[PDB]
A paper describes a structure:
By using a flavin transferase and carving a flavinylation motif in target proteins, we demonstrate that “dissociable” flavoproteins can be turned into covalent flavoproteins. Specifically, four different flavin mononucleotide-containing proteins were engineered to undergo covalent flavinylation: a light-oxygen-voltage domain protein, a mini singlet oxygen generator, a nitroreductase, and an old yellow enzyme-type ene reductase. The crystal structures of the designed covalent flavoproteins confirmed the designed threonyl-phosphate linkage. The elucidated crystal structures confirm that the covalent attachment does not significantly perturb the binding and microenvironment of the redox active part of the flavin cofactor.
We recently discovered a novel BtNR that is capable of reducing a variety of nitro compounds. Inspection of the crystal structure of BtNR revealed three potential sites for flavinylation: three neighboring residues that are positioned close to the FMN phosphate (R15, H16, and A17). The dimeric BtNR-F3 structure was determined to be 2.0 Å. Rms deviation with the structure of BtNR wt is 0.5 Å. The mutated residues from BtNR wt 11AYNFRHA17 to BtNR-F3 11DGLSGAT17 represent the flavin fix site. Intriguingly, for the first 15 residues of both chains, including Asp11, no electron density was observed, and these residues are probably flexible. The FMN phosphate group shifts 1.6 Å toward OG1 of Thr17, to which it is covalently attached. Despite the Cα atom of Thr17 shifting by 2.7 Å compared to that of wt Ala17, the covalent bond is formed. The phosphate group in BtNR wt is stabilized by the side chains of Arg15, Lys209, and Arg211 and the backbone nitrogen of Ala17. In BtNR-F3, besides the covalent linkage to Thr17, the interaction with R211 remains.
Numbering used by the authors:
A (entry chain B): 17 to 221
B (entry chain A): 16 to 221
Write the structure that this text describes.
Amino acid sequence: TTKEFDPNKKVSDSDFEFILETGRLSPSSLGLEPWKFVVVQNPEFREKLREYTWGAQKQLPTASHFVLILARTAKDIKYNADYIKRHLKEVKQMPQDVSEGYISKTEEFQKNDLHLLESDRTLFDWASKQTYIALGNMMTAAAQIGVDSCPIEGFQYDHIHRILEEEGLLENGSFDISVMAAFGYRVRDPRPKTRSAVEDVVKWV
Amino acid sequence: ATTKEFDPNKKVSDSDFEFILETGRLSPSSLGLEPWKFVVVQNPEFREKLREYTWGAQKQLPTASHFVLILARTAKDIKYNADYIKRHLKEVKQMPQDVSEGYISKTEEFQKNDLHLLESDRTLFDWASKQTYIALGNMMTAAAQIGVDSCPIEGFQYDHIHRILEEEGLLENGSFDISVMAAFGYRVRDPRPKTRSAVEDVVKWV
């Protein structure tokens, strides 16, 4: 938990590549990797975002690196989307017949196991969940090399969506904003962590 | 790091598993609400009841050293005006009554207007569930740091799993619902190497 960074201490290229790499190598439901990591270093772009990111008033100006994590939309991660076909063939190297079975399974999973086809937002939120795995792993990776981080949800979706859309970063409706993340070196010690009593959040069966 | 099957005769030590569980509990959450519960299911009978409707853990449930159900808080507890939040801010975060009133107002504006979380009970639940996926990742990474393999599991029939957890009393009068499951143990063999999109396809710099 850091809210503010040292604006003059930058995470090295190769430390940041390690953070991004732990994101890329994160697991995802069905191996679909329904994410994109947009690293926003451009000062002016940060300032546009900051106007609608109440939760990053200090983080955006000071962060060494700032990441928008995008999740795939229903357009791309519904069972029968082309993104999934390309993904299974080109990344997972799945034969055509193996991929047909995999897609069938994906279909049954989405429709009847988790009821993801209720709405386009339900599918989006499923893909977004996968991005929170990457988020956690990227923050943990950072911490392991002495790099502080802050997850950021405090933004006005409508504005952020507009800004990213105009910028072309959502790739004709393939993506939407999932969550943001600032990385850098803290300028002060964090609030000491408070957490629920162990017996309130753990039960053994 | 992708394991579908474990050694049923190699158990994670209580101490090693506590390290895993603790990194989960210490995970960050939006607004610090920690909207989760970790149910560790070691009872082989209970595993078998889950297994009947958990297609995605046919081999994991029998063989895992440890099996975890991660629950998320429902609309009942993490809607801005819910009592869970007041108790949480007061008793865990030690917020003065005046500070907590402001925090709740902010939570309300955040949920209604910033992220549109009150579109349905399911959208609000899915927000809390996303917090649980942070913990899930952290638990998996912690495991890997100490040589422990892990498998996340979404491959289950919601309706059946919900019913089973509900009947067992684990959802605490609608306070929780199933978010995601996780198996922990020692692999029976090395996994294939990971395939992933090339870095230039999933990273973009502005």
